[PDB]
Design a protein around this ligand. Structure first.
Ligand SMILES: COc1cc2cc(c1OC)OCCCn1cc(nn1)C[C@@H](C)COC(=O)[C@@H]1CCCCN1C(=O)[C@H]2C1CCCCC1
Length: 128
């Protein structure tokens, strides 16, 4: 499925090049601009554990998820990944625990050493 394709063909977008955050562009966005640290970013997403029956989606609430890039509301992988995206882009990210909830996890929601998969659509971003 989608996660396996990211493993096999995804680009490593980490600085350390440790394959901690792998990305496939599923739909190319518009223009050249990508968001700056501090920008408010508006997305739709679906997320799941790799090896789990936990699934989460913005589409359930039928409203975009909004956060400030780099301000710490979301996992490191999201700060790294969303910063690479253009408006209108859809991407798949596969994420090792070091860039998500680590060895500890965050129970009950997130277990120890969980790999996460997301599909993210970057709808818009706006400066502070
Ligand atoms: C729908 O509720 C949740 C969704 C997800 C994780 C959740 C969660 O709350 C229960 O708990 C993680 C542990 C507690 N927590 C929450 C937050 N920080 N720590 C803020 C939260 C915004 C952090 O979430 C993220 O960084 C990522 C990216 C943004 C969208 C949600 N994210 C999740 O990790 C999901 C998670 C995805 C995989 C399947 C289980 C849910």
């Amino acid at each position: 499925g989608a996660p396996a394709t990211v493993t096999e063909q995804g680009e490593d977008i980490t600085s350390k090049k440790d394959r901690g955050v792998l990305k496939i562009v599923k739909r190319v966005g518009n223009g050249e601009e990508t968001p700056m640290i501090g920008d408010k970013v508006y997305v739709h997403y679906k997320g799941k554990l790799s090896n789990g029956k936990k699934f989460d989606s913005s589409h359930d609430r039928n409203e975009p998820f909004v956060f400030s890039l780099g301000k710490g509301q979301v996992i490191k992988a999201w700060d790294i990944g969303v910063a690479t995206m253009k408006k209108g882009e859809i991407a798949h990210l596969l994420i090792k625990p070091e860039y998500a909830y680590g060895s500890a996890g965050s129970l009950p929601k997130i277990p120890s050493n969980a790999t996460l998969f997301f599909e993210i659509e970057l709808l818009d971003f706006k400066g502070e």
